[PDB]
């Protein structure tokens, strides 16, 4: 029986069967409740919506994301999202299939404890495992050595790996995100007179960030260019058909990843945390880490982030030492593709947690077996 492979996050849920080429169910991970008094009688009013339904109705709804910063912060909505994922959206009963689940590193242990407890008790899944996102990115990109940089909604984290061994002391985690880029985009967009207050407006801001932002290769030169000229300035059509024009801001938004001081944090940008992570590695491997940098997750999709990263690391790194950035176009899904590859492997079949082992050891077993 093909195991399920499910990758949760803040933002999209990605789920599918192991051995598939691409995920079968992808939908934004939202639970929505109505906030208006239902006036018509016999409508069939429904308690809450999940995924694409909550997106379509969203004008009626408060949208709440049950995972912030890779931590599940209310378990009922998350359990609703899994219920929708297995029954409604994959249409496959969990009592048949092992399941593989994905988490950001250096998370609290209770998140794994509760996630396993809900899988065994509430879905009766015959076996489960929890993988690290960064490890799976290496399977997807076809390597056994490199420093992974993976940034989605919520967590951003670097994990160096060398011939299949992690280096836990060198793992770095940061809370820059698609989400904090969105909140920055709203707060800067206010400058030109446009105010996006409600959550369903935030989804519009998110769509503006996806369609129009791009990472400036050199920041101050494009600031001067945008001050001098309209040519950089581009416009977008809100759902009601009004048009808004956004200028220098569209490059200003994704740079905060490079300069967190804009949003107000002090920890250095993803380039300097990448360099500092390499530096925490022992000196012999470092050539191979510089040779491979693997980007993952949606927040690394911006046009020109690959070249800005390569340039700014090359400026940090010793001049002889060849720096290469590996940004595959598919990289938004590569954590799922890696999970699919891993779950398909025959060697892995040894390593699932089984229901009997859970009944014997209780939900703490996950720390022992999984990582």
């Amino acid at each position: 029986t093909t195991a399920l492979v499910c990758d949760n996050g803040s933002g999209l849920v990605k789920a599918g069967f192991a051995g598939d080429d691409a995920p079968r169910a992808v939908f934004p991970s939202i639970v929505g409740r109505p906030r208006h008094q239902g006036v018509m009688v016999g409508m069939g009013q429904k308690d809450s919506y999940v995924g694409d339904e909550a997106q379509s109705k969203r004008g009626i709804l408060t949208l709440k994301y049950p995972i912030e910063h890779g931590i599940i912060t209310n378990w009922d909505d998350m359990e609703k999202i899994w219920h929708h994922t297995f029954y409604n959206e994959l249409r496959v009963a969990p009592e048949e299939h092992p399941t593989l689940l994905t988490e950001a590193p250096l998370n609290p242990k209770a998140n794994r404890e509760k996630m396993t407890q809900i899988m065994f008790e509430t879905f009766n899944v015959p076996a489960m495992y929890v993988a690290i996102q960064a490890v799976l990115s290496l399977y997807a990109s076809g390597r056994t050595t490199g420093i992974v940089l993976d940034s989605g909604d919520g967590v951003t984290h670097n994990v160096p790996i060398y011939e299949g061994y992690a280096l836990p002391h060198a793992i770095m985690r940061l809370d820059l995100a698609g989400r904090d880029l969105t909140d920055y985009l709203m707060k800067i967009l206010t400058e030109r007179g446009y105010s996006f207050v409600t959550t369903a407006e935030r989804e519009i801001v998110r769509d503006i960030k996806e369609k129009l932002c791009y990472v400036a290769l050199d920041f101050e030169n494009e600031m001067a260019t945008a001050a001098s000229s309209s040519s950089l300035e581009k416009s977008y059509e809100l759902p009601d058909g009004q048009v808004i024009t956004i200028g220098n801001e569209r490059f200003r938004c994704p740079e905060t990843l490079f300069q967190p001081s804009f949003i107000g944090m002090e920890s250095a940008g993803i380039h300097e945390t990448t360099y500092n992570s390499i530096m925490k590695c022992d000196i012999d491997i470092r050539k191979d880490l510089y040779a491979n940098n693997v980007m993952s997750g949606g927040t690394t999709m911006y046009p020109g982030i690959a070249d800005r990263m390569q340039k700014e690391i090359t400026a940090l790194a010793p001049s002889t030492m060849k720096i290469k950035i590996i940004a595959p176009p598919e990289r938004k899904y590569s954590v799922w593709i890696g999970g699919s590859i891993l779950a398909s492997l025959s060697t892995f079949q040894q390593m699932w947690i089984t229901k009997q082992e859970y009944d014997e050891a209780g939900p703490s077993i996950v720390h022992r077996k999984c990582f």
Binding site: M43, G44, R91, V92
Partner: protein, 72 residues
Amino acid sequence: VLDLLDEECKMPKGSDDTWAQKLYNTHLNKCALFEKPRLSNKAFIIKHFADKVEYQCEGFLEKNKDTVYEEQ
């Protein structure tokens, strides 16, 4: 079931999905004889005298409607 099907016939923008949702709201755990198939939302199960029977919703509202216009 028949009375909700007749209500859904007249109610505007009626459909087999909103009918099924009304079934689940009205009966799903109140009556031991009515049951929902776990893996689908377009069907329901009635425990009859002889046996359980899944009924699909997809036909129901299209088939249930009659109204004959007096001028015709």
